[PDB]
Write a protein that binds this DNA or RNA. Structure first.
Lengths: 555, 411
DNA sequence: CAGTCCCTGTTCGGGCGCCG
DNA sequence: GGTCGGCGCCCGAACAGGGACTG
């Protein structure tokens, strides 16, 4: 067997474990013909070699159809091998995005063929890549081969190819520094500001460099004219857009269908502004079977119809200009949903996106806005390596009030206010000093762990009092209920004294939404008030009326 | 031609496998130039995917510095080699360093590049340089010499370092010299003038062996933040409730605290804004509690076998308080920072500055870095903290969310 | 007292999308 | 078909830790 011009990556097994020894699956006669035709062809080219009985290893093998071609692809079920092979550190840290490309004079795209089959495998590792090819007769012993190149299906093949490919391109990139080469597996976006004459020269120069190592650049995949098809996109000299997206039009929707639906809507939200998947993802909660038909809700059918109406119109993105600033603007779409657009010139979006996570049981719009800014910042640093300036639908004074009084550290990068309703604001402010002339409510609540019963009420300085029996509750729900009662039966200004750290920690965070209906009712009463002062006192210390109301709600 | 000191991980533990976070453009260009230079001087060499280990890497600029500095987050590797730099080749900590009038820090990390690393251990110093928009796959390297920021580097170089410092330690015996990570702490009771001169004498004493920095500290002027009670002449119901709550919380630290006579003033169901006169038995319980807060806590002392822990509380208006302890309510040291860089505009910058100041103090006093309990959300911290870091070490931290209880550490 | 117990947050594992 | 790796999303479950109360 000849020596491959590329250096080979030394691969070991995990210490203590032997090679795979698994029996072959029964294969259909149409797949056996496709395998023997490709096996006999790869053994002529030095990519697989015959092995005898001295090789005690074996692994299954099969073949699937290639997309839009009569050719077949050979795949090996290395699931038992991959378990015992050594761990690899992948060198693919993410996916390039067209919004990060810079305008270049000339652009060329090429794709080498049979990429993994042009890179050798380690010599001392070829023994564990043994597999059997079942013949047309079940009694025929079958032909056993072992791989000489990177087997499609092994966990080290992509890692090894990406690193081997970068090593071959370094001498070219070292001699041609002004040439931009986007390397993603077997695909090379090549672009330069050189004139179109010396461009094609450097392309051919690359096509020969690569050829010296057994990497073929077929003219079938060569692309010299715009638009270019790269990474699911359509690259034009001034704009870009995603490859057409097709949503299913199922009359009866299954879970698996929504999952494919949600997945393509998320992919479309990168340049299609305003895609919402809130009500469609609400169909995937608490469901157990991809084989479970699910009816569309009224809010989900509306959300789908809106998204279909956005995909009808054509949208496009632009490229990155390092000379001008980066700008990102956020809007408040729906409750728990946010959208943004990143651009450098107005209405010429580099890309769009959405953020909708709900973090926590209790939160407000200011928290979610801060989470969205951070998601945009990280995403921006990935693609452009800088933080955009931000246009936020929150008043400067609103944000200054929040971060200065919040107990956690919080910060937003350089930003400016944009008046685009709905505006993010704080719905209520707890006073810092007790209110003069306001009735003072000493609240408490307790429950029994066993009976699940409890009381909650209050005692005031004006003689007012209330106690309410509660069924199927906890100690925390009662302490919250006691505060809800004091809010109900008080005027516009009220001082409230509790001994519940749990209740006080929730309200001081100024939430405007919650997963608990009792909290939402407390919030609604807090918005109606003009002045509210909350205070905490230690329990069981004989403090004020807090000990008098602790004894009323004791049982 | 130097012999390599054999190093091994702690038994039953693999190397670090931490993903590289995204880096800005100005950082990646700085790492490329440095790494290309360090490769040309043979300090590092390119590797491949067969190495399953990786450690994050980013760059910094020290205080009032224009040049970038390569920094590796070897916190995970240092945890997995802890038995080496503590048992076999430990460094003693001078208890007199914290008593000097002036202490100066010197980056001596460039000297570690003169000593080769053990061949079998180079596999764990692996790191990856990312690219903008993921143009190219990860450019991986590994160290061929003693890496900066690894705890095993100052322990191996310790024998070489002592021989360089002996001619200077002999001429200046009253000067205390401590070595932590890539820094060298030199403290002296001399006047500020001749102190800086002796630093330059050392600086040239290290330049002749094949090695520059300047950051002055004054540990004798380090103060602590006690628990203080308000000195009001007219007390309202609300004031007395806040006072009892604070005294109740402080009773976990000073067992002698009593709130019996003050709680008696909170018998009736009174309005919060109503003024209450202090009884005679209460005015004495308040003055006695003020004297107990003047006394030091009983039974508090540093344990070298225990990990330090630090908590930070945002007090607003650029105020930040902190406490260092090993066992709860046994605070070895409390304090408060104010008017740091980024006050009244940025909270992550202030929190980053406070951690650095606290860690620096922990190195001078105990020679250890505490594990921080940071008052911030993880994602907020992990997004911005690298943009304000100006130090060659990185402490450990965790994220807490404790709502303010009753302002115990700040009035 | 150490043990639950009530609550809240995090981590992970399992789907789909996209790319090669 | 039921191969690999990368990234993104969305959900549930499983795990973790911190309180408060009670045997």
């Amino acid at each position: 067997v000849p020596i491959s011009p590329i250096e080979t990556v030394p691969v070991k097994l995990k210490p203590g474990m032997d090679g795979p020894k698994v029996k072959q699956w029964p294969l259909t006669e149409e797949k056996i013909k496709a395998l023997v035709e490709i096996c006999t062809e790869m053994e002529k080219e030095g990519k697989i070699s015959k092995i005898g009985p001295e090789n005690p290893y074996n692994t299954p093998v099969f073949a699937i159809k290639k997309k839009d071609s009569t050719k077949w692809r050979k795949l090996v079920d290395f699931r038992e091998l991959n378990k015992r092979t050594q761990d690899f550190w992948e060198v693919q840290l993410g996916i390039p995005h067209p919004a990060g490309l810079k305008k270049k004079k000339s652009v060329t795209v090429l794709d080498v063929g049979d990429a993994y089959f042009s890179v050798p495998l380690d010599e001392d590792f070829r023994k564990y890549t043994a597999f059997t090819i079942p013949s047309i007769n079940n009694e025929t012993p079958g032909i056993r081969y072992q791989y000489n190149v990177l087997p499609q299906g092994w966990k080290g093949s992509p890692a090894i190819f990406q690193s081997s490919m970068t090593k071959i391109l370094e001498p070219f990139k070292k001699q041609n520094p002004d040439i931009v080469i986007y390397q993603y597996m077997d695909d090379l976006y090549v672009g330069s500001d050189l004139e179109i004459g010396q461009h094609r020269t450097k392309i051919e120069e690359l096509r020969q460099h690569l050829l010296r190592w057994g990497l073929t650049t077929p003219d079938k995949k060569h692309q010299k004219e715009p638009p270019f098809l790269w990474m699911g996109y359509e690259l034009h000299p001034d704009k870009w857009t995603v490859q057409p997206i097709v949503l299913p039009e199922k009359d009866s929707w299954t879970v698996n269908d929504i999952c494919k639906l949600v997945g393509k809507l998320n992919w479309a939200s990168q340049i299609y502004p305003g895609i919402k998947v809130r009500q469609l993802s609400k169909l995937l909660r608490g469901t157990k079977a991809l084989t479970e038909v699910i009816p569309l809700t009224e809010e989900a059918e509306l959300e789908l119809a809106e998204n279909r109406e956005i995909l009808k119109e054509p949208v496009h993105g632009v490229y990155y200009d390092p000379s001008k600033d980066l700008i990102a603007e956020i809007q408040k779409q729906g409750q728990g949903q946010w959208t943004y657009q990143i651009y450098q010139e107005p209405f010429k979006n580099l890309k769009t996106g959405k953020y909708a996570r709900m973090r926590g049981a209790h939160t407000n719009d200011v928290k979610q806005l801060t989470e969205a800014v951070q998601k945009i910042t990280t995403e921006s640093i990935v693609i452009w390596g800088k933080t955009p300036k931000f246009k936020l639908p929150i008043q400067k004074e609103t944000w200054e009030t929040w971060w200065t009084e919040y107990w956690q550290a919080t910060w937003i990068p350089e930003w400016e206010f944009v008046n685009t309703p709905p505006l993010v604001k704080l719905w209520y402010q707890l006073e810092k000093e007790p209110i003069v002339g306001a009735e003072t409510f000493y609240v408490d609540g307790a429950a029994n762990r066993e009976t699940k019963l409890g009381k909650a009420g209050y005692v005031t300085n004006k003689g007012r009092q209330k106690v309410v029996p509660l069924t199927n509750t906890t100690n925390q729900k009662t302490e919250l209920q006691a505060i809800y009662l004091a809010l109900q039966d008080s005027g516009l200004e009220v001082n409230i004294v509790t001994n519940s750290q749990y209740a006080l920690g929730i309200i001081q965070a100024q939430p405007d939404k919650s997963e608990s209906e009792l909290v939402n009712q407390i919030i609604e009463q807090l918005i109606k008030k003009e002045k509210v002062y909350l205070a905490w006192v230690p329990a069981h210390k004989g403090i004020g009326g807090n000990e008098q109301v602790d004894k009323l709600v004791s049982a | 031609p130097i012999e390599t000191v054999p190093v091994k991980l702690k038994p039953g533990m693999d190397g670090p496998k931490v993903k590289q976070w995204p880096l800005t453009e100005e950082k990646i260009k700085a790492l490329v130039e440095i790494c290309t230079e360090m490769e040309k001087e043979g300090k590092i060499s390119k590797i491949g995917p067969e190495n399953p280990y990786n450690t994050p890497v980013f760059a910094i600029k020290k205080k009032d510095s224009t040049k970038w500095r390569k920094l590796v987050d070897f916190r995970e590797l240092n945890k997995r080699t802890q038995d080496f730099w503590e048992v076999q080749l430990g460094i003693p900590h001078p208890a007199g360093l914290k008593k000097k009038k002036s202490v100066t820090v010197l980056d001596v990390g460039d000297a570690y590049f003169s000593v080769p690393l053990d061949e079998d251990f180079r596999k764990y110093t692996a790191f990856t340089i990312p690219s903008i928009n993921n143009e190219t796959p990860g450019i991986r390297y590994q160290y061929n010499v003693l890496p900066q920021g690894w705890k095993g580097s100052p322990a191996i170089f310790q024998s070489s370092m002592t021989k360089i410092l002996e001619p200077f330690k002999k001429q200046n015996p009253d000067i205390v010299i401590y070595q932590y990570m890539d820094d060298l702490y030199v403290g002296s009771d001399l006047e500020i003038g001749q102190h800086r001169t002796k630093i330059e004498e050392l600086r040239q004493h290290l330049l002749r062996w094949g090695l520059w920095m300047g950051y002055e500290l004054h540990p004798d002027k380090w103060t602590v933040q006690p628990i203080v009670l308000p000195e009001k002449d007219s007390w309202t119901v609300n004031d007395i409730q806040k006072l009892v709550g604070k005294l109740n919380w402080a009773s976990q630290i000073y067992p002698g605290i009593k709130v019996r006579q003050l709680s008696k003033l909170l018998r009736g169901t009174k309005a919060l804004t109503e003024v209450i006169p202090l009884t005679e038995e209460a005015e004495l319980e308040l003055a006695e509690n003020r004297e107990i807060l003047k006394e030091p806590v009983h039974g508090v002392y540093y344990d070298p076998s225990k990990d330090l822990i630090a908590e930070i509380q945002k007090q607003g208006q650029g105020q930040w308080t902190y406490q260092i302890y090993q066992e709860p309510f046994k605070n070895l040291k409390t304090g408060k920072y104010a008017r740091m860089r980024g006050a009244h505009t940025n909270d992550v910058k202030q929190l980053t500055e406070a951690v650095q100041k606290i860690t620096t103090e922990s190195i001078v006093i105990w020679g250890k870095t505490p594990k921080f309990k940071l008052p911030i959300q993880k994602e907020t911290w992990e997004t911005w903290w690298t943009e304000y870091w100006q130090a060659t070490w990185i402490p450990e931290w965790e994220f807490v969310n404790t709502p303010p209880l009753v302002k115990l550490w700040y009035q």
